[PDB]
Design a protein around this ligand. Sequence first.
Ligand code: NA
Lengths: 179, 177
Amino acid sequence: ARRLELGEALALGSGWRHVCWALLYAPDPGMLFGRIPLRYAILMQMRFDGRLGFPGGFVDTQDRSLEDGLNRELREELGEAAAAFRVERTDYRSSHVGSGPRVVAHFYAKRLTLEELLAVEAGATRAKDHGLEVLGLVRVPLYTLRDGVGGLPTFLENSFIGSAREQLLEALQDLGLLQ
Amino acid sequence: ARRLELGEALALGSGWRHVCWALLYAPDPGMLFGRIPLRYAILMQMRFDGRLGFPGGFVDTQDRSLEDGLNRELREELGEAAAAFRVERTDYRSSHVGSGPRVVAHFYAKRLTLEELLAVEAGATRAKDHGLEVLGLVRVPLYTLRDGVGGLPTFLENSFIGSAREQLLEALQDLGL
Ligand code: NA
């Protein structure tokens, strides 16, 4: 897909929709079976349309900026625990020309505490969106199991919204969250 | 993949292993967007290997029964709120046998109240397996969006464990989908 600089993405015409996406993650010393290290807890969401994506949403008229809407979309999607933290410009990573009509996507990534992250998993089922535009949260498995396939490689065979799969890969590399 | 009656599978030597799956569902009057009926809320686990499947698991020998073992497995995976109900032999649907691995797979379905099922979802992250063998719970979308693609058919392009996708399609056919 077509990478764009943030400023050129804000410059696009009035017929463009802007959509904001957050990778929310925290460190995880946990060990699966006491032997495979999780390394980090990273969240993704099953969308209404059967696809895996990131938390976020379309920025609306009364949004004074990308971040105020992003955070607003998160609270609607994840519930009150999202209020504990605020995704900010420093967390911004990239902007992409999405798919379909005139849509451009902004990708953020925000390190939390494991308690913060867990507190968002635990309340996510009382949110406005849940059971409607949102079907379920899952953690991205960062390990590859003994048969060579189960874990991350298998998990990437799933359906992703737009280009989420590519943004995820890029972010695990840039943030060093594998190997 | 062959189909077996229960007593046939229960006769088989002790070294054969047993795996038991439960499809938990509940009527959901909900309307997605105000326009698309949900009909039923059904739950699926995303297992540790990246594959989606029903809650369930292997029986160990401290499990007396197919059902104790199944019901043991659900408490571990979904938490305390699984105790609201017990999956019984009356909810048995079928059994299947594989090629290579010597395991019989038994399939169950258990009708909940919607509040029962939401308590299972709400309580799910305090379950022992959460963040280890279970990565999270999804609902199954039973609709198809206008495009013929978004919804159930895309949900079906995910990766699944074993006979889950099939077991789901089987259960949807009986329910009136
Ligand atoms: Na599991």
